[PDB]
Amino acid sequence: GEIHTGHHSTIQYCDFSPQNHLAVVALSQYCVELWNTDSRSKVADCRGHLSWVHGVMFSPDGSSFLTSSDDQTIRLWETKKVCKNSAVMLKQEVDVVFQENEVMVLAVDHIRRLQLINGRTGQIDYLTEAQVSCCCLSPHLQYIAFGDENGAIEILELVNNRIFQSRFQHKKTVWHIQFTADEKTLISSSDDAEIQVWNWQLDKCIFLRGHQETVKDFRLLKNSRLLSWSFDGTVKVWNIITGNKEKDFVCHQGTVLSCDISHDATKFSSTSADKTAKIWSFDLLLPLHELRGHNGCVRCSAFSVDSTLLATGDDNGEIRIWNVSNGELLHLCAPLSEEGAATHGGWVTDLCFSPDGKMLISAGGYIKWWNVVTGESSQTFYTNGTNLKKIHVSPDFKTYVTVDNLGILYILQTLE
Amino acid sequence: GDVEKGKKIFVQKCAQCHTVEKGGKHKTGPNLHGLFGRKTGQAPGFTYTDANKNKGITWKEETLMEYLENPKKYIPGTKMIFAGIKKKTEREDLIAYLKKATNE
Numbered sequence: 153g154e155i156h157t158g159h160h161s162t163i164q165y166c167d168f169s170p171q172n173h174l175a176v177v178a179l180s181q182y183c184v185e186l187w188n189t190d191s192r193s194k195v196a197d198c199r200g201h202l203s204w205v206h207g208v209m210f211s212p213d214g215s216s217f218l219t220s221s222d223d224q225t226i227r228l229w230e231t232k233k234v235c236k237n238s239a240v241m242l243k244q245e246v247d248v249v250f251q252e253n254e255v256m257v258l259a260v261d262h263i264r265r266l267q268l269i270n271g272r273t274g275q276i277d278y279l280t281e282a283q284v285s286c287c288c289l290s291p292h293l294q295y296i297a298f299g300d301e302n303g304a305i306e307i308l309e310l311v312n313n314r315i316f317q318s319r320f321q322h323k324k325t326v327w328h329i330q331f332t333a334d335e336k337t338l339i340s341s342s343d344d345a346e347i348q349v350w351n352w353q354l355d356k357c358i359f360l361r362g363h364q365e366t367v368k369d370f371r372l373l374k375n376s377r378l379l380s381w382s383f384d385g386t387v388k389v390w391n392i393i394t395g396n397k398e399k400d401f402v403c404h405q406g407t408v409l410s411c412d413i414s415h416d417a418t419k420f421s422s423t424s425a426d427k428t429a430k431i432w433s434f435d436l437l438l439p440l441h442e443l444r445g446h447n448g449c450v451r452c453s454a455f456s457v458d459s460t461l462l463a464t465g466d467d468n469g470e471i472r473i474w475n476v477s478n479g480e481l482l483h484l485c486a487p488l489s490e491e492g493a494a495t496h497g498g499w500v501t502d503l504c505f506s507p508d509g510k511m512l513i514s515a516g517g518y519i520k521w522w523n524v525v526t527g528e529s530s531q532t533f534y535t536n537g538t539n540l541k542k543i544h545v546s547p548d549f550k551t552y553v554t555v556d557n558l559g560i561l562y563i564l565q566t567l568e
Numbered sequence: 569g570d571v572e573k574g575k576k577i578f579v580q581k582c583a584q585c586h587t588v589e590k591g592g593k594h595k596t597g598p599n600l601h602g603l604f605g606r607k608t609g610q611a612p613g614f615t616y617t618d619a620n621k622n623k624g625i626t627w628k629e630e631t632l633m634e635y636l637e638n639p640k641k642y643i644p645g646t647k648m649i650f651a652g653i654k655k656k657t658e659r660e661d662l663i664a665y666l667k668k669a670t671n672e
């Protein structure tokens with residue numbers, strides 16, 4: 153016999169089943185597929201272990217199997233369930249754009265490209281492409297866009313599928329993608345030192361010649377300015393559309409680890425990168441203050457929802473709130489104290505402040521609504537997937553849904 | 569550290585997935601030549617996880633000492649399988665060996 157495995161790589165784990173000639177094989181990255189031996193065809197996908205499996209084995213009856221995993225988790229499973237198909241559990245990284253009463257979550261098709269499923273409905277919206285690398289909707293709707301493995305970036309029109317612009321650029325797959333306040337002008341970056349600004353239709357190709365090894369990421373500023381940072385840790389302040397490095401900052405000799413901008417006026421912005429939590433008002437070429445309250449060095453930070461708070465996230469998920477006024481020894485939010493290494497939690501991915509500003513939605517191993525300054529508010533929850541890496545909030549702030557670890561997407565809608 | 573013991577530890581615990589010599593091939597893990605003073609996720613020609621690719625730290629003794637104690641905790645979602653070296657002495661030895669060999 154000779155049963156070829158899915159695609160190509162190198163097997164990390166495998167397990168033959170004497171019944172039904174089944175083969176529960178964890179190829180790589182917890183790819184625990186259910187194949188069928190001799191017949192040499194897959195039976196069904198099996199999503200649901202976090203940490204990339206560590207091991208699996210069938211019952212002596214063969215009617216079931218254990219699934220040891222790196223999380224520290226063993227999931228029992230019936231034999232019958234695996235064979236049946238279950239094209240679900242959205243892809244791990246997605247972008248969601250919120251336009252009011254209904255929220256739409258970006259998705260990657262279980263087989264190829266994508267499907268847009270709006271919440272509170274069964275309205276799937278499938279589209280075709282040779283496996284999109286990443287996606288972004290246009291400002292004021294009316295368009296849709298996606299990247300490519302070559303770094304090419306198409307922007308399909310909604311009104312007509314025939315109309316599109318394709319941009320060929322970047323040595324590899326395109327990284328960050330963002331649009332101007334104008335419906336026109338794509339902006340992107342990747343392995344190139346330059347930050348691409350490719351206006352579509354016009355097919356313009358303005359470049360941000362930063363002379364970095366690469367630019368790690370960039371974001372829109374309220375002005376025509378375009379904020380950016382690279383692996384040299386420079387916090388550059390360029391310009392949108394037209395490349396022009398108007399204000400330049402060297403907040404970190406190391407890479408800018410997470411940098412957050414506040415979003416009222418352009419009055420403040422800050423970053424922390426395993427060194428110091430610097431903060432500036434852009435008016436100076438150097439930060440207005442350089443927070444140094446953490447010897448273990450703050451990993452990430454996020455601004456208040458148009459207030460004066462400023463979280464500073466630690467590697468262990470610890471948060472230290474800092475007033476947006478140079479800095480003072482504000483009581484640490486201190487969100488996690490007792491726990492250990494037992495589960496999901498690693499990383500301090502994001503902070504979602506409540507509109508009231510009285511609550512911080514910490515999201516690491518799972519969501520917890522720490523009360524700002526001392527203690528916690530609505531800590532509860534506990535996510536199924538764990539490991540959420542993105543935060544989406546409705547203008548109202550009523551609903552945030554997280555998909556973490558590919559567990560699935562979860563939507564929250566508090567009641568009365 | 570004791571470079572000789574560090575070598576033993578490397579041979580025992582790292583060599584099955586990584587080379588340290590210049591132009592040594594990528595195995596399951598990336599070649600470690602030039603590791604010190606380099607940012608995470610930069611070996612050209614190795615396909616990292618996004619987690620390892622975006623950890624955003626510089627490899628050096630301090631960062632290695634913490635990583636090697638518990639890789640998953642330092643880079644959650646890494647595809648590197650390694651429990652960690654719990655004894656500090658052994659970590660120092662290994663790190664001292666890597667410091668020598670990955671420059672050589």
Ligand code: HEM
Pocket residue numbers: 578581582583584585586596597598600603607608609610611615616617619620621627636645646647648649650662
């Ligand atoms: C003490 C022994 C080991 C040392 C010193 C070591 C060293 C390293 C270092 C420093 C990195 C990250 C460097 C970078 O970011 O470019 C790394 C990543 C990696 N190592 Fe190891 N390693 C060891 C054991 C292992 C073992 C046992 C395996 C597999 C069995 C392995 C496979 C990998 C893989 C696959 C990655 C890539 C991580 C990712 O892309 O997510 N290593 N190793």
